[PDB]
Ligand binder design. Structure first.
Ligand SMILES: [Zn+2]
Lengths: 101, 178, 64, 70
RNA sequence: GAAGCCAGAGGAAACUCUGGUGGAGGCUCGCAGCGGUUCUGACGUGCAAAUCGAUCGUCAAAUCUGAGCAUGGGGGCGAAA
RNA sequence: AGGGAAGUCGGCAAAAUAGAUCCGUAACUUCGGGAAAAGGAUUGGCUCUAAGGGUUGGUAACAACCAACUUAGAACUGGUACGGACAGGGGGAAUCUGACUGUCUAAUUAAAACAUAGCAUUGCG
RNA sequence: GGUAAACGGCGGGAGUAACUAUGACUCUCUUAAGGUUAACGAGAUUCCCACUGUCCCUAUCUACUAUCUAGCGAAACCACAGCCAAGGGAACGGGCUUGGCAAAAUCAGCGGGGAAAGA
RNA sequence: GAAGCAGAAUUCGGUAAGCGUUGGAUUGUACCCACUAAUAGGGAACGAGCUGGGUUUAGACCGUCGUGAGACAGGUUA
């Protein structure tokens, strides 16, 4: 289930995008900025247990491994396998290109 | 804090609280402390054996069984050569304690009498009233005493202790002399 | 004194008050939504203990 | 430390030591005796009134309860 | 998940631990029933001279309940208002 | 929408939590509890696999026949949602208070009131 | 005489004085208690997280009313009536005086006044 | 309009009610904080709108008083 479905679409309840997660997977700098955004003392397990694919912090290794066998994790893996939707894909869909000379 | 006072004043104060305190636990603690100091050093007795006995002999008929047991421990701690000259007053206190109504204090008084016999037998059996009055008390609290109505005769562990103390008293009185 | 805190709360090794409250929160289960320790509630517990005398403390008398 | 504080305070004013508990009080007899002495001083009046002052949570109502017994 | 019971590992024994079995409790969530906590509740010449809605307490008992009978006013009856 | 008690005497009211499986669960304690403490990970569909049985018949540790519901594991797949409606704990830190279960003012007060076990006293052979 | 887990009450002794009772006055001891509050609760209170139209600050939708029609159809209340301003000694005015003024018959709301609380 | 009123910021006084004069904290019981141009003062009540205290029917508890029924110096709950 989803906690508080009445306000799931509010801006203050927004979750991380797939393109951001893909950039975190490719580059550790972008993930480093996302982690320096949060104060590590207020994270489960002091932020030592993190799933990049789900962009989630977990309390323990047992919790992380239990997450890794679940269908939300496999959905995130399949979405990353298909690829996130980006601006370049939007321009490719509309047949528009950048001319840098 | 009671730390500036010396050991003699501690001894006298704890003896006074052991005699006059209204708390059973406080009397037990005071008696245990004075017994501990008398066990550690017999020389640590500012008031002396006579004063100690004079203060703690009324405590035989106390209702507190733990206080009675600690009083017996004090009596066993107390030096026998100093116990020996004062056998008569102690024997008055054992006679009162045996004549007391409560069976528990009767048994503990028999224990005190056993201590008195094993410490100073000859003074008990030779002092004025130490023989016949003690025999009268024994007969009275065993019910062995010698207008048209007849009277029924007057637990087990108490009677066994009574007969054992009587047997030891008779053995002490008729012990073979060399 | 530090050993009084260690005996009272059965915890040791903190470097400051923030880490002490965080360790006490994680031990006692004072956790908010998202696994965040409740440092405010734990500090309130420790203050209540301090004024109610569950934590031993005194002011020493001046020397003569 | 308590005895040292009693010495420091008894340099200034008459002081008593107290544990304000209904079940297990300490100093209750001494406080009763002190109030009896003050009543002997003010025997000409029909009664004396003793008011308790101090900070919050020092034990004023607990001292009253310990002296009363209820 | 209480006694009682079974097996295993120890322990000289007594006992200790583990896994079971069992189904106790004026125990607990909760339907009916019984009751009546809260709502700027509905209703206020009302459906009703005390009703209606949501919510709430209890639910294996000091639980709920019928019929027959007993106690009758300077009286009865009252876990007592 | 954004903010999240700034409203109000007062979070009144509403919202939020909710079933089941698994990880885990503090102070205090009359050791019985607290405890569903707290705090977390999951739940659809489809196709499979595995385990848990009965009857009859002279290493039978085997043949034949029959049977229904649970439990665990795996792949694939839709997704904004998977206890998809219904149903369904918000939780925690403290203080006062009555031991608890129970009972009463039908028609304004359900309570620190009453009762209760336990304790003590009195009269009577 | 006895009795305080009866109601109650919270010190004692000595000196002085010597009918009876009182008091006064000194002196002196002046103390029972220091190093299980659980569980349960429609009991009362404060705070924290979450949460939200409680609020900023209101907007919109649905049903049943209210509305109109056909039929049916009361009651409360009622001295007579109902626009105000100033004065009307008894700090009262809807009627009197002096002014403002003032145009049939009506419908839906409304709560200032009158009226309306088994008031 | 006046003032060592240089400028800036003002202070005192005058005509003026046209136009505004806020958001909060604190109930173990009227003052603080901030924004603002400013957070001026009153009347129409205080000579049957709603809602918190004064405030107080019937239940209950503690404190003081009373032999008592009960009352109150009072405090608390519905
Ligand atoms: Zn993941």
């Amino acid at each position: 289930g989803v906690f508080a479905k009445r306000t799931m679409t509010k801006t203050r309840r927004r979750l991380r995008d797939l393109d951001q997660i893909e950039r975190d997977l490719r580059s550790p700098r972008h993930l480093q900025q996302y982690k320096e955004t949060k104060a590590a003392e207020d994270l489960p397990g002091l932020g030592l247990y993190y799933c990049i694919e789900c962009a989630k912090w977990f309390e323990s290794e047992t919790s992380l491994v239990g997450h890794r066998k679940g269908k939300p994790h496999k959905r995130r893996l399949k979405q990353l396998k298909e690829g996130a939707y980006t601006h370049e894909e939007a321009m490719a869909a509309i047949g528009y290109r950048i001319d840098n000379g | 804090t009671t730390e500036g006072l010396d050991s003699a004043e501690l001894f006298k104060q704890n003896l006074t609280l052991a005699v006059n305190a209204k708390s059973d636990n406080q009397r037990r603690d005071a008696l245990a402390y004075v017994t501990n100091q008398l066990s550690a050093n017999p020389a640590n007795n500012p008031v002396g054996t006579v004063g100690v006995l004079t203060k703690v002999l009324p405590l035989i008929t106390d209702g507190a069984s733990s206080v009675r047991v600690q009083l017996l421990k004090l009596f066993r701690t107390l030096p026998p050569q100093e116990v020996r000259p004062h056998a008569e007053k102690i024997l008055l206190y054992i006679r009162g304690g045996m004549t007391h109504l409560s069976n528990d204090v009767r048994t503990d008084t028999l224990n005190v009498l056993d201590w008195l016999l094993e410490v100073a037998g000859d003074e008990v059996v030779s002092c004025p009233g130490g023989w016949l009055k003690t025999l009268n008390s024994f007969s009275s609290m065993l019910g062995w005493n010698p207008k048209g109505w007849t009277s029924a005769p007057k637990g087990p562990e108490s009677q066994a202790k009574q007969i054992q103390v009587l047997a030891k008293f008779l053995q002490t009185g008729f012990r073979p002399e060399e | 004194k530090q050993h009084h805190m260690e005996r009272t709360y059965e915890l040791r090794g903190w470097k400051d008050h923030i880490e002490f409250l965080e360790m006490l929160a994680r031990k006692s289960g004072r956790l908010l939504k998202g696994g965040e320790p409740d440092v405010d509630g734990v500090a309130k517990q420790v203050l209540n203990d301090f004024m109610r005398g569950k934590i031993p403390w005194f002011t020493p008398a001046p020397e003569p | 430390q308590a005895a040292a504080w009693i010495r420091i305070l008894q340099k200034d004013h008459p002081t008593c030591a107290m544990r304000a508990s209904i079940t297990n009080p300490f100093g209750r007899g001494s406080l009763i005796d002190l109030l009896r002495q003050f009543s002997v001083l003010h025997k000409d009046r029909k009664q004396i009134s003793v008011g308790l002052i101090g900070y919050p949570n020092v034990g004023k109502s607990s001292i009253i309860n310990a002296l009363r017994g209820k």
